[PDB]
Write a protein that binds this DNA or RNA. Structure first.
Ligand SMILES: [Mg+2]
Ligand SMILES: [Zn+2]
Lengths: 139, 148, 90, 1110, 50, 52
DNA sequence: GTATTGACTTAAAGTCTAACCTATAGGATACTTACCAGGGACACGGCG
RNA sequence: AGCGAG
């Protein structure tokens, strides 16, 4: 907004809840654009329905247009009709079918995951990359 | 005591703050806005990817394939291999070449990952934030003027 | 090495701003009803263009009167007097 | 020597035994070897006719025969043969098609069981060919393959000292071609140890027992040293199978150890050619170093256990401190450490070697696809034509000649630049040192470089030492090493027999120096003759019994450095800069041969290839400004066609004009039409200018130059620059682009010159912004704003639905329009896919010298032009002749390039002419002057060869006798200084001034290409901060150092302004433009866009970054 | 223990701790380097960009 | 310059916050008890299922 | 000049029908494990 | 990749 209301800049871990709170959708298909019409594809990496329209103030089909329909979503394609520059601002999120570990907290020596769990870096690398089992509970 | 002390520089951090130690393990991977990884129709129609859509495509392909393999019902060998591949894909997305050979693209060159954008003299912190190109500027050869 | 070909070029932007300003002024020169008809014909006032019938309805006059006054407005604005203040923008 | 040449008299006191070689041989001879031409066949047969095999023949022979896993059938290649080139050289250069020739190889398929042979030519592909000028033509462009300097494969022994013990520990590194390194290192502990493929060390006895040695045998061979006995004792490995098991467990862990994969493991790793090819040079080096198979020819580059055993024995003997070893059945060799930078270990991969290696990679790929398909090949249904896929080979060749770093864009600023781009040895590239990984010991000069590589000519940027230039007389050994000629001096008697020695052979011989006086009987006229020895140390000398002598002076300098007169009076830095700056001189319109030059001018021009030379003797039948027809001595006649006003790669002019009349008889090899920078056949890079060496009013301050206006009036420093603009109408979604004079919305004034068909007419002057090619691409339906629709109705127009993408003279350019080259699909001309037309317009401008342009002499005395004075306020000699240039005296003494002053003096003498007064004999200072130099007519060209030239005493003498200009008046006293009159004040300067004639060149750093400015323009894609570069409309980088300087000044507001609204903030940018244009205050700056880009990048790294308000 | 803490903050914590029960945390001066002293700053945005 | 484009386009149209089309926020509920508002325009049937 | 009606033609839909893309399935001899730097600092495994 | 200034 304004560089006077910029008192602090905090950095911290982003939990899965934060990641899916930033997101305006979920990229579910590994597609970018149409080969022939060269337009953003549905649910793809460049999806217009998630990150906004490629052209200022239009839905994907063309039903709603112009500033007069600002803040609306076409019911056919689902694109919100607003400025295209929001495509530089809105994020998505992929819902992993299985959990993964952030590499920065595993490989970066000292292995912070290892120090937290007291697992040797070799052991952590074996567990995480499915080379050796590990016991998580014992009655 | 030395190993104990080093471990208390990471075990204290997750205590002093109300941060969970869970943020290390991901269930969702954020996807950067598309125009920060543009796909541009260069002159001649030849499209130019962003080198990050490839890593994201790999992640999404492997995630969807994992979903389908779990849905069908597959032996633990194949599903565990798929999970390892998904872990490697997310690793390559966040940092190429940190573990194993870097993921290479066409021409046998490493794929510019999501962390290479920040590190180095050609990274973002040093090539586009502290130093920038400016308008209203020119350059020319200098010649002595003693009458000035 | 690739130029964003869809960035505010910062010269056409000021050109458009001054174009709107001078167009508004030259419109204010002509009679008020004339200004209104041309405005609501091209949707300058709020970005919504309409045809003869709508303007006839809103002013409670048959379509044909709006058409006629529109023709007179175009003829007036085309006069060399109010064209040199609007050329170099097309 | 050359039939028709300018008579340049020389101050040379030494006769040259060897004529300068075929300076371009480095490229053409290597390529002829690769092809296997009859010329190379004869040259090799003269010197080793045992096994003349070309590069392609070698590749085919190594590849063939091939068989499948079962060996039921095999394929072979033979008889490579080239067809005639597809198109002539000029046409290939014109229409953008590669200058290549078809390659045919006879295949042969033998079904080993059934017993059928099937042979047929296979058309391996369009092999690019080398033009007679030693250069390739690829995609119309002119390219040069620069030789590469690489570490020669072989065995290298090193010794170091360990801090923790302070003991001399040695090491060896058998370095193969595409093998696995075996470094038999010796540690501080007294135990030798192997390190196979860089894997966790081993005791050597383990490998020996892996080779099947018994401990009794091991002590029988490596028994003399205590280190070996210690290793056997502490090894603990008992048994051959134990050693093999341990070796396999260490080399390839994770797989179940066996006996089969323990033995064949090592056998395949080292002693099978599949994976450990040493190459011919590598095996020859190993044999010579260890003295194993000196007599026998070379074949089967793969190793033998004997080689490894001998390497271990040599390392151990070296550690003990022995001097020589005699391997059983091998000649004894001296035990000593190797130097990696010695030119007995740095070999040249010439153009032939690089192209052959790429052919080899492509053939390996083709071989692999052949083998893979052979399984799925129906027996008896297959022929070599349908079994061979040439695509990998042609793909490898094409990807080499383009985008390979050793296939460089030909550097043609002038003939010298092209000639020196050839004969260039770069120590970096594929399989070579990289600038970052290259240490500081490879960049230095080694004693072995003398005569094989120039110590002076070298880039001065971050490439010093990695790129050098081959010396004048240097030659390349068939094995890739660089040889240099020497005169065999026998029994103290110098001879003429010129032996070409490589660095190794030179070290073993006590080689003398070129300028050693000879008594005219072939014998040295003095004891104490200067000499060099093996260690590179120049020191005192054993009189008599010196085995070799330098062929001539200047043997150590390259072609570019051989054209600097008075080189010996210049420091290495200034000589280096002069050499690197001769190659930047632009071709002037006229070109004048220097008054003071060398013997290399004529040969350099001839061998550069940009000067036309008659092929055979004959009488010029008809000469015109575009061609020369010559009638040969026997009936036939030949027409040489000049290349008029052609554009070089770097934008300069390539004009050729004849220098022969319509009746002259011309002999074979005679120059008949000078090139761009040539005058009467000899190279001419600049102009001779009357120079004063005084300081003048602070305008020639700090290496700045002030030139008379005569140089702009008479047009002596002026260069034609031709610039090509390309535009291609393509096929787009909305339709196709048209090239016509119907550009939308643009008036009938800026559509004036454009022809009936679009593209501008020839000879039409165009200034920056004018239209060259009128192109119109479709727009597709869009949304005209209400304001613009109203305006169109008021002014009665239509959208036209087609945008303009016309080609325009880019900003800051101008000039006429030489010619238009139009390629079109409709006329069936090869064009890329999806383009209908491609038009190129050539725009020529005659640049005149102006302040900001860079000038230089040949002695590193560079400088930009600060001012161009009128001729009237120019110092003029007492005669009235104004001086043309004024250099500063403050730059001579400290830069240590006094040679320029010498040149100046000599130049003046050459300009005036002289007569030594030999009334009573010859003056003592002129006794050793060559005859006929005692008298020179005015304006007499002279030469001072590099390291034998005009001694200072001879120059003093010639300066004393300087026969008068027109009346009896010597304008330059014996001191060389003239009394000058002030142009402005009018009074004479109180003291004489050093005046003469300096030959100065106009470097290609013209201010017209350097000026740039910007107020607003394109902005980069992902970030703002506008594009950089004069080519775009580029903003000047404001880096971190500049920002620190601003912070130190305390100027916070200017820094914020710069980094926010001038660069990145996309909302405050148009706002500041509005404020400036409307007279309002510049607005408050916002958040730079790059910071939000950073925030999104951090968040996408799963880092929750949030900007807390407070 | 082994933590490198700024002297000003060290004194501030000592002042905060003398009251409400005094447990003086003894410390010893250290000479860092320019790189270590820079990367130990309290601002991650400058250390990261360094 | 290579002069690329992101496709799409720009549209300078004076931003208005005063006279705006009427909207009817429609609430949807996913399986995991998560509500989600969606500002659809009144002149269109509110769909019965939304990919939230 | 400004108030109208009665025709008189026209582009934009709005829609039905046809072809040309698109998501998807299948294919039965037998084939079963791929492919040259240094210089400093910190951390992990062996050995004493 | 070559190249310029320090
Ligand atoms: Mg300088
Ligand atoms: Zn829509």
């Amino acid at each position: 907004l304004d560089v006077n209301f910029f008192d602090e800049l905090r950095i911290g871990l982003a939990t899965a809840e934060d990641i899916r709170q930033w997101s305006y959708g979920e990229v579910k298909k590994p597609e970018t654009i149409n080969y022939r019409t060269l337009k953003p594809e549905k649910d793809g990496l460049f999806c217009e329905k998630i990150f906004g329209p490629t052209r200022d103030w239009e839905c994907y089909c063309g039903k709603y247009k112009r500033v007069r329909f600002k803040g609306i979503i076409c019911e056919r394609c689902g694109v919100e009709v607003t400025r295209a520059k929001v495509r530089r601002e809105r994020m998505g999120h992929i819902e992993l079918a299985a959990p993964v570990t952030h590499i920065w907290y595993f490989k970066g020596v000292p292995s912070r995951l290892g120090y937290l769990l007291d697992l040797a870096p070799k052991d952590l690398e074996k567990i995480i990359y499915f080379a050796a089992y590990v016991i998580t509970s014992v009655d | 005591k030395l190993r104990a002390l080093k471990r208390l520089k990471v075990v204290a951090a997750f205590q002093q703050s109300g941060n969970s130690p869970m943020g290390m393990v991901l269930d969702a991977v954020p996807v950067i806005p598309p125009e920060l990884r543009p796909m541009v129709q260069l002159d001649g129609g030849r499209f130019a990817t962003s080198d990050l859509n490839d890593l994201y495509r790999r992640v999404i392909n492997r995630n969807n394939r994992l979903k389908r393999l779990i849905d069908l019902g597959a032996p633990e060998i194949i599903v565990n291999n798929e999970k390892r591949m998904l872990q490697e894909s997310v690793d390559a997305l966040f940092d190429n070449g940190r573990r194993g050979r870097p993921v290479t693209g066409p021409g046998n060159r490493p794929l510019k990952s999501l962390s290479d954008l920040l590190k180095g003299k050609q990274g973002r912190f040093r090539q586009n934030l502290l130093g920038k190109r400016v308008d209203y500027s020119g350059r020319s050869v200098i010649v002595v003027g003693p009458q000035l | 090495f690739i130029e964003d070909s869809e960035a505010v070029v910062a010269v056409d932007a000021v050109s458009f701003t001054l174009l709107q300003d001078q167009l508004q002024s030259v419109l204010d020169t002509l009679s008020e009803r004339e200004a209104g008809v041309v405005r609501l014909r091209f949707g300058l006032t709020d970005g919504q263009p309409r045809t003869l019938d709508e303007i006839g309805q809103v002013y409670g006059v048959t379509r044909e009167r709006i058409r006629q006054i529109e023709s007179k407005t175009m003829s007036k604005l085309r006069h060399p007097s109010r064209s040199q203040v609007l050329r170099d923008y097309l | 020597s050359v039939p028709g040449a300018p008579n340049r008299v020389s101050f040379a006191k030494l006769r040259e035994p060897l004529e300068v070689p075929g300076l371009l041989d480095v490229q053409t001879d290597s390529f002829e070897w690769l092809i296997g031409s009859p010329r190379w066949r004869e040259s090799a047969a003269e010197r080793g006719d045992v096994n003349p095999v070309g590069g392609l023949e070698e590749v085919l022979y190594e590849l063939s025969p091939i068989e499948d896993f079962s060996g039921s059938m095999s394929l072979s290649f033979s008889d490579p043969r080239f067809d005639d080139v597809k198109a002539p050289v000029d046409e290939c250069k014109d229409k953008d098609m590669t200058y290549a020739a078809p390659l045919f190889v006879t295949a042969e398929f033998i079904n080993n069981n059934t017993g059928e042979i099937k042979s047929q030519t296979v058309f391996m592909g369009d092999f690019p060919m080398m033009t007679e000028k030693g250069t390739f033509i690829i995609n119309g462009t002119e390219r040069v393959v620069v030789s590469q300097l690489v570490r020669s494969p072989g065995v290298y022994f090193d010794e170091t000292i360990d801090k923790s013990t302070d003991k001399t520990l040695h090491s060896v590194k058998v370095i193969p071609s595409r093998g696995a390194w075996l470094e038999f290192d010796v540690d501080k502990r007294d135990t030798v140890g192997v390190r196979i493929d860089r894997k966790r060390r081993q005791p050597v006895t383990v490998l020996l027992k892996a080779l099947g040695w018994t401990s009794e045998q091991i002590v029988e061979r490596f028994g003399f040293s205590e280190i070996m006995r210690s290793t056997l004792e502490k090894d603990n490995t008992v048994g051959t199978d134990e050693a093999l098991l341990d070796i396999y467990r260490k080399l390839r862990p994770g797989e179940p150890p066996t006996k089969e994969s323990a033995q064949t493991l090592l056998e395949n790793l080292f002693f099978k050619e599949k994976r450990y090819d040493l190459a011919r040079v590598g095996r020859y080096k190993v044999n010579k170093k260890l003295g194993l198979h000196v007599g026998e020819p070379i074949t089967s580059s793969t190793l033998t256990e004997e080689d490894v055993v001998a390497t271990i024995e040599y390392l151990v003997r070296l550690h003990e401190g022995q001097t020589t070893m005699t391997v059983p059945g091998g000649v004894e060799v001296p035990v000593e450490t190797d130097d990696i930078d010695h030119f007995g270990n740095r070999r040249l991969r010439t153009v032939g070697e690089l192209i052959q290696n790429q052919i080899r990679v492509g053939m390996s790929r083709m071989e692999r696809v052949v083998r893979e398909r052979m399984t799925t090949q129906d027996v008896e249904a297959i022929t070599p034509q349908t079994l061979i896929n040439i695509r990998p080979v042609v793909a490898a060749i094409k990807e080499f000649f383009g985008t390979s770093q050793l296939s460089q864009f030909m550097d043609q600023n002038n003939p010298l630049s092209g000639l020196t781009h050839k004969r260039r040895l770069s120590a970096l590239g594929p399989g070579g040192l990289s600038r970052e990984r290259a240490g500081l010991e490879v960049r230095d000069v080694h004693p072995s470089h003398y005569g094989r590589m120039c110590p002076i000519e070298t880039p001065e940027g971050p490439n010093i030492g990695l790129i050098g230039s081959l010396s004048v007389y240097a030659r390349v050994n068939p094995f890739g090493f660089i040889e240099t000629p020497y005169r065999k001096v026998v029994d103290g008697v110098v001879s003429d027999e010129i032996v070409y020695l490589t660095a190794d052979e030179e070290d073993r011989h006590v080689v003398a120096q070129a300028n050693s006086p000879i008594d005219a009987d072939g014998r040295f006229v003095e004891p104490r003759v200067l000499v060099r020895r093996k260690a590179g140390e120049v020191e005192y000398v054993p009189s008599s019994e010196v085995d070799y002598m330098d062929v001539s002076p200047r043997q150590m300098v390259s072609v570019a450095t051989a054209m600097i007169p008075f080189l010996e009076h210049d420091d290495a830095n200034r000589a280096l800069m002069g050499a690197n700056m001769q190659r930047q001189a632009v071709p002037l319109v006229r070109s004048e041969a220097p008054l003071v030059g060398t013997g290399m001018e004529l040969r350099a021009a001839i061998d550069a290839g940009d000067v036309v030379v008659a092929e055979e003797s004959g009488v010029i039948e008809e000469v015109s400004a575009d061609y020369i027809t010559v009638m040969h001595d026997n009936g036939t006649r030949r027409t040489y066609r000049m290349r008029k006003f052609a554009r070089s790669n770097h934008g300069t002019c390539a004009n050729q004009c004849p220098i022969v009349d319509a009746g002259d008889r011309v002999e074979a090899g005679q120059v008949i039409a000078d090139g761009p920078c040539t005058d009467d056949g000899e190279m001419a890079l600049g102009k001779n200018l009357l120079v004063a060496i005084m300081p003048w009013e602070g305008h020639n301050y700090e290496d700045a130059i002030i030139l008379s206006n005569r140089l702009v009036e008479e047009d002596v420093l002026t260069s034609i620059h031709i610039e090509e603009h390309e535009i291609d109408a393509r096929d787009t979604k909305l339709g196709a682009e048209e090239i016509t004079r119907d550009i939308p919305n643009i008036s009938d004034e800026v559509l004036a010159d454009l022809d009936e068909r679009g593209i501008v007419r020839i000879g039409a002057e165009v200034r920056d912004g004018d239209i060259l090619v009128g192109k119109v691409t479709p727009k597709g339906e869009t949304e005209l704003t209400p304001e613009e629709r109203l305006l169109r109705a008021i002014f009665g127009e239509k959208a036209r639905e087609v945008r303009d993408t016309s080609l325009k003279v880019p900003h800051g350019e101008s000039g006429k329009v030489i010619g238009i080259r139009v390629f079109s699909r409709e006329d069936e001309d090869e064009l890329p896919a999806g383009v209908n037309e491609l038009v190129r317009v050539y725009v020529a401008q005659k640049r005149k010298i102006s302040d900001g342009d860079k000038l230089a002499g040949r002695h590193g005395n560079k400088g930009v032009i600060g001012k161009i004075l009128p001729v009237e306020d120019m110092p003029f000699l007492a005669d009235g002749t104004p001086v043309d240039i004024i250099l500063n005296t403050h730059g001579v003494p400290r830069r240590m390039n006094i040679g320029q002053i010498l040149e100046t003096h000599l130049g003046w003498c050459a300009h005036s002419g002289w007569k030594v007064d030999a009334a009573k004999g010859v003056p003592d200072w002129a006794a050793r002057l060559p005859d006929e130099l005692l008298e020179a007519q005015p304006n007499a060209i002279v030469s001072t060869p590099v390291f034998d030239g005009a001694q200072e005493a001879e120059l003093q003498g010639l300066l004393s006798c300087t026969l008068p200009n027109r009346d009896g008046d010597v304008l330059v006293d014996a001191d060389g200084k003239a009394m000058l009159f002030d142009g402005r004040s009018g009074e004479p300067f109180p003291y004489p001034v050093t005046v003469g004639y300096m030959y100065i060149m106009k470097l290609h750093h013209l201010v017209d290409d350097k000026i740039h400015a910007r107020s607003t323009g394109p902005y980069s894609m992902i970030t703002q901060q506008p594009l950089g570069g004069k080519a775009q409309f580029g903003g000047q980088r404001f880096g971190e150092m500049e920002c620190w300087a601003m912070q130190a000044y305390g100027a916070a507001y200017t820094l914020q302004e710069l980094l926010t609204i001038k660069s990145d903030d996309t909302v405050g940018r148009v706002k500041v433009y509005e404020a400036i244009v409307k007279g309002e205050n510049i607005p408050e700056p916002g958040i730079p866009e790059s910071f939000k880009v950073l925030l999104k990048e951090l968040q996408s790294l799963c880092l929750n970054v949030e900007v807390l308000s407070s | 223990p082994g933590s490198l803490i700024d002297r000003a903050e060290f004194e501030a914590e000592n002042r905060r701790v003398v009251a409400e029960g005094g447990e003086p945390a003894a410390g010893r001066p250290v000479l860092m380097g320019i790189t270590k002293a820079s990367l130990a700053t309290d601002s991650w945005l400058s250390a990261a960009s360094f | 310059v290579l002069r690329g484009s992101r496709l799409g386009a720009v549209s300078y149209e004076t931003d208005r916050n005063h006279d705006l089309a009427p909207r009817q926020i429609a609430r949807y509920r996913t399986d995991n008890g998560e509500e989600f508002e969606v500002p659809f325009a009144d002149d269109a049937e509110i769909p019965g299922t939304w990919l939230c």
